[PDB]
RNA sequence: CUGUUUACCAAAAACAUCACCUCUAGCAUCACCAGUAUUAGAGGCACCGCCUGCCCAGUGACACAUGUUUAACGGCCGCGGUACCCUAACCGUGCAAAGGUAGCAUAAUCACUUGUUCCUUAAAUAGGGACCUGUAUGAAUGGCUCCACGAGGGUUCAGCUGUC
RNA sequence: AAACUCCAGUUGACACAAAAUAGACUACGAAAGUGGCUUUAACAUAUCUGAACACACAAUAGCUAAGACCCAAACUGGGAUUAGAUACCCCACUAUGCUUAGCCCUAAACCUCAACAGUUAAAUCAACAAAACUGCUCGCCAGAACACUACGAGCCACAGCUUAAAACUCAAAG
């Protein structure tokens, strides 16, 4: 069998490597961005628990953990 | 739940062999556990266990003999591995040793209740029933269940403090 | 089990041989070893030069020890040999003796390999 | 090497006959293997190249081995043909 | 696929259908904006 | 980060600092230390996270046998041309120890300049986000992010009020 | 050429590196993998199949410390070649290859051929390849390319891995 698939694959590859490599700054203010979006968004639907269930604040001695954080 | 073999003690071989309390003292331990190797002790500590329980203590191909013979195994590969921390090819023979005996121990327990309970109480061996859903606790997971029951907690008490509002 | 000590010496006199031997021996009884027998294999020259203990030797008495000793004596032994300057090597292995050698029939020579490609023409 | 010399890889020379005894040496070498040995070790020859090379001297080695059978089971039959003109 | 495979499947679905550049109408109403030649 | 400082015009972004790294030293009866290289001294830098590029020619140290050494002092290119213009993947030539890498950049930083654009006001030489790109940004003289913190500097919603 | 010239050549002493021959053998292991010697421990299951909501593993290369240093060596620097040579050739030297303790979880991880039970009878049978098949089960696939990609999610992984699309485009791709 010929290799002229592997070859669209390979080039394919190497040029999202290159890309990746000069973007990955961009990349990484854009990522901690989602992280941090994604915090808030797992303390609204754990504060939006406990606000369902008739309860007007956080159980007490509770503190939502930052999961997202290295 | 710690009773050690004695070391003493004669081979399986040479237990039988009549007129063995005759020969030398020397002889004694050319026979016996101390110069021998790990297998042959695990040879006696089934036979111990084989008789302790089954009812036949000859019939080797029943469900519960291989149970015990399967038990004896896995106490040694978990003493192997006590010392040899990095030895994943044991690993891998203690823990599918492990999933086998729970297969064996589940169709014993279907057919068997009786002698199913003599094996668990002989062999100090604990039968637990398979979970039902083998799901991942990531922390997104293992948070919301954690606030999730300390909710429901508080929420109980505020029945608590609504019957003392009736009054 | 049984096993058996390869007992290389220093090829010294009969004094330091006899020793030698009678400290080697001990030191196996001292670790639980029922010791069966000794052989002297006759003081040759080395095959080749062995160091050992800050000294370059070319001959030196060859004896066995034949004897049965617990698993863990194995280690004991082993150890106790590299800190006697009187042997230049030692080595425990299990007893020949002890393996059975199986009744072999005999050689049957190998046909040719069949049906590894199909009979089709080319 | 801590062995004696003059033992191992040695031809004594007759009648100073050096071209003969220099074959007879050279034919040990490689009747043994180590010439060839020596050449491959010039240069690290990788696992993965030393399997495909094993493999193909051994494919090689049988073919060779079963032709030079066909041949000498048929070398019988070069004789001169005894039908000739029919 | 075993039976049993293809009872825990199912039926093979169907892609939903792309609509057009029409958006599945027959004809569209336009307002020319410019004029030009394409090769 | 808590801390520290110009008692009496400066409390700070300055210093220290956990951390990281460079240098020196094989040893006792007065410091270090009644210690002994996982130690103890001399310094840099500044938690952590991502990193910390290239240069040993010069000057210093060390080796003083050809040398070694930048988390030592320091440094880190030109002149012409080529895709309308812009720019040059590219081309020619020269020069250096190496030719400023990764980042970052309308600002504690600012020729033009109050750049340009998006937000923000009715109105912005303010502030924020970007882009342009650097007379003279740039990697322990640390570079770039980020939690928390600050009588620090700046911008602001709402309210509040004799600030008006 | 540069390089070395505290260098070469006999001889002696000397590894924490790597394991001629045997091996024309074809064994062990779930796969990855395993070929110097010794010893200890030790190679699951007395039906079969079966976890991409789980566990335990997984070459090489990488990462985090702490050591080792014979050689080999990305990078880098010189020598050479060339129109250029950021290569191929030469020399030198590093990460790295080793040990220990944790990670990372990827391969043309392919013998690209699933496990178990069977059949060479028929009509073998597109081509080629390693002959055509039956029962049973699981896992996978459904034009090309966008795409080992984006989003989302998980992960000790922050230039990572695993899952994994769509729009525009084409009349082919194979
Ligand atoms: C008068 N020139 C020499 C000058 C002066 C200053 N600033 C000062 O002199 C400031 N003086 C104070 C300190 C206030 C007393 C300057 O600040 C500058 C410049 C030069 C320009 C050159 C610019 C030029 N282009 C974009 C117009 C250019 O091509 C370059 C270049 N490197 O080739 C530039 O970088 C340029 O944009 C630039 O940055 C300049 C200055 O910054
Ligand atoms: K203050
Ligand atoms: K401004
Ligand atoms: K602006
Ligand atoms: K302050
Ligand atoms: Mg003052
Ligand atoms: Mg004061
Ligand atoms: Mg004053
Ligand atoms: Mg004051
Ligand atoms: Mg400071
Ligand atoms: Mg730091
Ligand atoms: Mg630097
Ligand atoms: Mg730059
Ligand atoms: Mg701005
Ligand atoms: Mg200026
Ligand atoms: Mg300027
Ligand atoms: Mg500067
Ligand atoms: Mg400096
Ligand atoms: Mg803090
Ligand atoms: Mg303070
Ligand atoms: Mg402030
Ligand atoms: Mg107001």
Redesign the pocket.
Known sequence: ??????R???M??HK??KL?????????????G?????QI??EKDLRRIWLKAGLKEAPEGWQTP????? | LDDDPPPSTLLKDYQNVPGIEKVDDVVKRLLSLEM????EM?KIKQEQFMKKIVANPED??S?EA?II??SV??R??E??LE???????????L???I???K??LKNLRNTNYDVFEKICWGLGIEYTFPP???????????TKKALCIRVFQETQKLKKRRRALKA | ?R?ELALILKAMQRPETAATLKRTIEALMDRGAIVRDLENLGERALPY?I?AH?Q?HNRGGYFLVDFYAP??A??SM?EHLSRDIDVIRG????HPLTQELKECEGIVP?PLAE??????K? | ??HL?FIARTVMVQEGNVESAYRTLNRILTM???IE?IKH?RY?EK?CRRRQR?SY??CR?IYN?EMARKINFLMRKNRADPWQGC | ?????MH??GP?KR?PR????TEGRPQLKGVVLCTFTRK
């Open positions: 069998k010929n290799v002229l698939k592997i669209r694959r390979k394919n590859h999202y490597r990746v490599k000069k973007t990955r700054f961009l990349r990484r203010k854009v990522q901690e989602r992280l941090r979006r994604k968004k797992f930052k999961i997202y954080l290295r | 021998a190797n790990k297998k695990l080797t191909r469900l291989r013979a399967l195994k896995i040694s590969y003493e192997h010392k040899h921390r990095k030895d994943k090819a044991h690993k891998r023979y823990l599918m040793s999933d086998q005996r297969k064996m039902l859903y083998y799901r991942r606790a990531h922390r997104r997971f293992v | 089990p096993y030069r160091s800050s370059q698993t863990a194995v280690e082993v080595n425990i292995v299990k190998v049906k590894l490609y199909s009979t089709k080319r | 090497a801590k010399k043994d293997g180590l040995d070790r690290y696992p094993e001297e051994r080695r081995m | 696929a075993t039976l049993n495979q825990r499947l093979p892609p792309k609509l057009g550049p």
